[PDB]
């Protein structure tokens, strides 16, 4: 053929891939974390937006730390041979490096490690997108006038 | 012939390191609101980083917190794009 360039990811596999949305709204009372009013609006917005991008969306609601880890383990071990990419959206409380299950924290590294180039061969060389709506600390940006 | 195991991840953070992230109980979070609008408007036209750059500007310019508590009133937010991607990403083909 003619000259070719390899500057973009192959996005024309039979499927665009999974879009896992974890929508954590209500937290076990013993944690002392407040309900995240409005996150259902986020969850439905994301579901529709990625539906139209032709992602296979799975909405999960109010998962424990254990359920988040298991879901990530299970999803990583699925057959991604026909999938272009992977998207995981996390909606929860958090702090730097951490997001919360309904019953306690999960290290972000623990979640993303399931998809490492060597631990998830189904996705090696394929874009893995983590979209994280969660606090990263307690600092407030006072902004500056323009 | 090998690639790093950390390659080909992108982390679209709603807020800068160390900071709160703002959520509106009626409208949804500032970040997710803006991300969905920019995806809808530009996913058939722009590369992913350039979409996410529009999300940054939208969150940075169009949103400001309102609170009866002086500590939390009038605050701003910038999201944080973290890319270990090795290629450009277009949602179309």
């Amino acid at each position: 053929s003619g000259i070719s360039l390899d500057n973009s990811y192959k996005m024309d596999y039979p499927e665009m891939g999974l879009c896992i949305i974890i929508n954590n709204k209500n937290f076990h009372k013993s944690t002392g974390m407040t309900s995240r009013s409005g996150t259902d609006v986020d969850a439905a917005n994301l579901r529709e937006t990625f539906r139209n991008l032709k992602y296979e969306v799975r909405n999960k609601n109010d998962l424990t730390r254990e359920e988040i880890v298991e879901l990530m383990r299970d999803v990583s071990k699925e057959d991604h041979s026909k999938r272009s990419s992977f998207v995981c959206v996390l909606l929860s409380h958090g702090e730097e490096g951490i997001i919360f299950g309904t019953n306690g924290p999960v290290d972000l590294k623990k979640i993303t490690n399931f998809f490492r180039g060597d631990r998830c061969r189904e996705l090696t060389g394929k874009p893995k997108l983590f979209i994280i709506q969660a606090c990263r600390g307690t600092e407030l940006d006072c902004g500056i006038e323009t | 012939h090998k690639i790093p195991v950390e390659a080909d991840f992108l982390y679209a953070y709603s807020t800068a390191p160390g900071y709160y992230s703002w959520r509106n109980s009626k409208d949804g979070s500032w970040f997710i609101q803006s991300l969905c609008a920019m995806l809808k408007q530009y996913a058939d036209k722009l590369e992913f980083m350039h979409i996410l750059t529009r999300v940054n500007r939208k969150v940075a310019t169009e949103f400001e917190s309102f609170s009866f508590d002086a500590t939390f009133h009038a605050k701003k937010q910038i999201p944080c794009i973290v890319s270990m991607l090795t290629k450009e990403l277009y949602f179309y083909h």
Binding site: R36, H93, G94, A134, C135 | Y20, W22
Partner: peptide, 4 residues
């Protein structure tokens, strides 16, 4: 406007 709420924080998380």
């Amino acid at each position: 406007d709420e924080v998380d």
